[PDB]
Amino acid sequence: TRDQNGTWEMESNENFEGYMKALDIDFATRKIAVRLTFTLVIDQDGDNFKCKATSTFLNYDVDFTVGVEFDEYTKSLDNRHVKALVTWEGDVLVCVQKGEKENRGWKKWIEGDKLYLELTCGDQVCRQVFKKK
Ligand SMILES: *C/C=C/c1cc2ccc(N(CC)CC)cc2oc1=O
């Protein structure tokens, strides 16, 4: 399915530190961030997405339209400027963040009532799995 609407509670988190280290997140923010569980709230209407990931400390907010390139200032993460583009590869939602970092982006897909998120930077791949609340 291409329907990722929902409130999604973290079930698994693998190699979050490696991804954040690849982004050069400072040590203290990174060490706290690796410890924390996230809820992902995805508000999707056709091609229009609003994605909010919340923890007790760090936050992530992005709005986009599938297939429309946009400037992203990554800000609360690594404070960089990228040219972001979100598209479908089958039922996998693929984001490429064009900029200083290679292989930077993410992939989101549904596999049996679970939402998978892959965060990529360089040769680092973080895998997070969420359950629909
Ligand atoms: C497609 C959604 C990706 C995504 C990206 C994120 C970046 C940073 C963070 N945090 C804590 C809330 C910083 C450690 C979370 C996050 O969640 C996501 O789903």
Swiss-Prot record:
Recorded superkingdom: Eukaryota
Entry keyword annotation includes Nucleotide-binding: no
InterPro entries for this protein: Calycin, Fatty_acid-bd, ILBP, Lipocln_cytosolic_FA-bd_dom
Binding-site positions, all-trans-retinol: 40, 108
UniProt domain comment: Forms a beta-barrel structure that accommodates hydrophobic ligands in its interior.
Annotated family: Belongs to the calycin superfamily. Fatty-acid binding protein (FABP) family.
The name this protein goes by in its record: Retinol-binding protein 2
Organism: Homo sapiens (Human)
